[PDB]
């Protein structure tokens, strides 16, 4: 399958390369414009504020991670060493979990707004908005352990190791645990996005829009973006269970820079919370 | 460009009615007018809100008791206060907010970004 393995290292090599590059550029951009102008516009925070500052602190952490996965890919080997292969491995995982929940929690403040303009309700404060911040972190920190856990039995002490838990180790295994994340990471609080849309449509049809479209954008960017790369992650360890298995693997490395296309359009989001944040930022 | 005065304020018997006036001095058409309320040594709390469009919100303790009405051609926003108890006592305030839609979707995280603020005038419940 030698013809299989020369399309596994152009795609590392340029497709990654200038997918993750481009993600770097408009990210950094991106998240800097909405970071500054949260950090000298906004003077008093609401829990969308808490969850949206949130989201690009975790877009940057994995922004920070790409000079060094560019520089792996182009070069075909992983040379930076044990701690850093950790401490990546770690932040490309939770920046992809951490960003559809905050998306989530975003849509139900939306919801409980549209009802409770006044914000009297507990759910509503900006305090409790900062403590489902901190438990979304821990969370999405422990449903990435055992992923961490498994690279700390493989030889990282080596500096030149690595490993993809899709790629390396138990089959089994790695099924299970991709098959648990993508439930509990993805589909979970995509349908729960989706009920709070639902629940939101209802409300109006009573009463009877902006709350409508943040929630519809969150759910088909992350429909869109999270769908191949969740569907090839599974393929690629099921396959493991050949040309075969390398076609699989091109397909799988082509789904990575797509589900990762989140975190440089997720600014997006600063302007559909009703603040006429965009013209605060042209004023200043 | 609007100043605005807010005026109305008296003493109450606890079940009794006010209508408290905002009236501007500048048009009011665009603009969205929430009404605030401080009682001593607690934080400022939105109470009712109309859009410039014309929609109204009110907060959850003055929902079945509170009306907010405007008048552009006079440029007065009205507050109907109907069974006002004790813990109404309060400096109630106006606040204007130029971009008409916006003040009413989240009054109390979006009154912080507003500079048109009036005096407040005292509301004060008591018996006898
Ligand atoms: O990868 C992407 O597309 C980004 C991505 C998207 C996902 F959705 C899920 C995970 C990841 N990725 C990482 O979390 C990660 C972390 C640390 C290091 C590497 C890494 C390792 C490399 O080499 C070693 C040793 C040689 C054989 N292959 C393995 C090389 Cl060459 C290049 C590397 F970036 C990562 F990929
Ligand atoms: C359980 C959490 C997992 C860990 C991630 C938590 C947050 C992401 C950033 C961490 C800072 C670590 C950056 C490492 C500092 C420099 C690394 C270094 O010096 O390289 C050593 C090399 O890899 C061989 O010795
Ligand atoms: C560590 C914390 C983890 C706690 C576990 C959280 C589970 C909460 C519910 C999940 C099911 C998904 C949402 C419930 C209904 C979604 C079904 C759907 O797809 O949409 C519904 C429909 O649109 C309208 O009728
Ligand atoms: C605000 C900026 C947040 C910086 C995140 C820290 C970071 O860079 O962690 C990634 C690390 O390089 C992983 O190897
Ligand atoms: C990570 C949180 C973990 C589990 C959810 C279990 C219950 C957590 C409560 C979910 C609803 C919620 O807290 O949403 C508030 C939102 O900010 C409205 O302003
Ligand atoms: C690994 C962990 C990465 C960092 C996680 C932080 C979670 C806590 C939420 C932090 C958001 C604080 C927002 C804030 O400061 O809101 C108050 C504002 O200053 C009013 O003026
Ligand atoms: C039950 C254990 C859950 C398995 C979760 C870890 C799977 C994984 O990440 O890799 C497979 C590894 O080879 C396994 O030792
Ligand atoms: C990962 C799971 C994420 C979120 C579960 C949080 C869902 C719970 C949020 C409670 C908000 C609420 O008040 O819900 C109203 C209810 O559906 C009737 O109107
Ligand atoms: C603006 C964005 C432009 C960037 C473009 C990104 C590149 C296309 C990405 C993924 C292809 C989809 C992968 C296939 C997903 C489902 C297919 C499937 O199920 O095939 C499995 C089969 O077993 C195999 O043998
Ligand atoms: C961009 C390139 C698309 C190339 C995607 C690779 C297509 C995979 C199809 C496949 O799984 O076929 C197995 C292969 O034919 C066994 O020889
Ligand atoms: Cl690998």
């Known amino acids: 399958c030698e013809n299989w393995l020369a399309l596994e290292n152009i795609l590392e090599k340029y497709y990654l390369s200038a997918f993750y590059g481009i993600e770097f550029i408009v990210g950094m951009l991106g998240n800097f414009t909405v970071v500054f102008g949260y950090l000298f516009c906004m003077k008093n925070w609401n829990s969308s504020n808490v969850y949206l500052f949130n ?92 992923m961490l856990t498994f690279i700390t039995s493989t030889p990282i002490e080596k500096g030149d190791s690595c490993v993809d838990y899709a790629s390396s180790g138990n089959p089994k295994y790695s099924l299970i645990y991709s098959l648990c994340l993508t439930l509990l990471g993805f589909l979970i609080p995509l349908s729960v996005m989706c009920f709070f849309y639902y629940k939101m449509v209802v409300f109006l049809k009573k009463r009877s829009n902006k709350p409508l479209r943040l929630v519809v954008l969150a759910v088909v960017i992350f429909s869109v973006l999270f769908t191949p790369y969740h569907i090839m992650r599974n393929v690629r360890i099921a396959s493991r269970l050949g040309c075969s298995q390398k076609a699989i693997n091109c397909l799988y490395i082509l789904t990575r820079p797509l589900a990762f296309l989140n975190s440089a359009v997720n600014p997006i989001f600063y302007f559909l919370v009703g603040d006429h944040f965009r013209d605060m930022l042209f004023s200043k | 460009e609007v100043q605005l005065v807010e005026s109305g304020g008296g003493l109450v018997q606890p079940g009794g009615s006010l209508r408290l006036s905002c009236e501007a001095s500048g048009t009011l058409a665009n603009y969205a007018i929430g009404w605030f309320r401080q009682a001593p040594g607690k934080e400022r709390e939105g109470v009712s809100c109309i859009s410039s469009g014309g929609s109204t919100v009110y907060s959850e303790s003055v929902k079945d008791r509170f009306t907010i009405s405007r008048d552009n051609a006079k440029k007065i926003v009205y507050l109907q206060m109907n069974s006002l108890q004790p813990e109404d006592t309060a400096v109630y305030y106006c606040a204007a907010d130029p971009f008409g839609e916006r003040l009413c979707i989240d009054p109390n995280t979006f009154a912080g970004y507003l500079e048109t603020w009036g005096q407040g005038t005292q509301v004060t419940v008591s018996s006898l």
């Open chain 1, 55 to 146: 989201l690009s602190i975790s877009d940057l952490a994995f922004l920070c991670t790409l000079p060094m996965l560019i520089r792996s890919y182009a070069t075909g080997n992983w040379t930076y060493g044990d701690v850093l292969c950790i401490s990546n491995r770690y932040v490309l995982h939770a920046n992809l979990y951490t960003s559809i929940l905050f998306l989530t929690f975003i849509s139900i403040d939306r919801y409980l707004l549209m009802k409770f303009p006044f914000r009297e309700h507990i759910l509503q404060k900006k305090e409790f908005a900062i403590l489902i911040s901190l438990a979304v972190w821990v969370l999405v920190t422990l449903e990435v352990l055992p």
